[PDB]
Design a binder for this molecule. Structure first.
Ligand SMILES: CC(C)(C)c1cc(Cn2cnc3c(Cl)nc(N)nc32)on1
Length: 207
């Protein structure tokens, strides 16, 4: 079954602003998603220090960047702590409320400071018409979150191949944003914004 939810009003407003504002510096989305992955890897690494069984779902802590010109997608994969169903439906949005209000006040400021308000994920909509999030947290099931904005998102149990643990952010890119599938563009962005991330970042090459 697919459940459909309304974004909190302030998050719907933020998403419309990101989608509708003229802003050429769209590449900051990738640094924000890599930062989220790094934070998630930090969290599971920390938790493993007192409960080693937390890594039974996979010992490798890494980030993969996977472009697909065929699917017109850029996928950011991590083996971090992952998100629970409650994370996806309510709890992360609840935390994002205060940051969203503060960010939207500041804009009224540059869109590139979005990460300093804890809502960097939504910068994905600078480049993506739809975002699909596949995520697996220890002691919860594997879920697919999805939204093309417009005020709603869906959550379902994922039937795709299992992940073990972590999060895959699948960016279904807008037609005019296919530069983010080019190897040299991704390398340039990571080198400029994410050169000091403390986990291996592997940029997959297309076949
Ligand atoms: C999808 C939606 C619920 C809207 C979201 C996603 C984020 C950012 N984020 C929070 N926890 C995360 C983990 Cl565990 N991993 C990664 N990669 N990202 C994470 O915030 N909200």
């Amino acid at each position: 079954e697919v459940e459909t939810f309304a974004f909190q009003a302030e998050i719907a407003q933020l998403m419309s602003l990101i989608i509708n504002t003229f802003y050429s510096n769209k590449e900051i989305f990738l640094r924000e998603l890599i930062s989220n992955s790094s934070d998630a890897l930090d969290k599971i690494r920390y938790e493993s220090l007192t409960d080693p069984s937390k890594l039974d779902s996979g010992k490798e802590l890494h980030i993969n960047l996977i472009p697909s010109k065929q699917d017109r997608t850029l996928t950011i994969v991590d083996t971090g702590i992952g998100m629970t169903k409650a994370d996806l439906i309510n709890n992360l949005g609840t935390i994002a409320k205060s940051g969203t209000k503060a960010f939207m006040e500041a804009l009224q400021a540059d869109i590139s400071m979005i990460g300093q308000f804890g809502v960097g994920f939504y910068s994905a909509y600078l480049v993506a018409e739809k975002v699909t999030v596949i995520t697996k947290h220890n002691d919860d099931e594997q879920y697919a979150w999805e939204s093309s904005a417009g005020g709603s998102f869906t959550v379902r149990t994922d039937t795709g191949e299992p992940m073990g643990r972590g999060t895959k952010v699948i960016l279904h890119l807008k037609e005019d944003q296919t530069e983010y599938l080019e190897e040299r563009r991704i390398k340039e962005i990571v080198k400029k914004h994410s050169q000091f991330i403390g986990y291996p970042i592997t940029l997959f090459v297309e076949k």
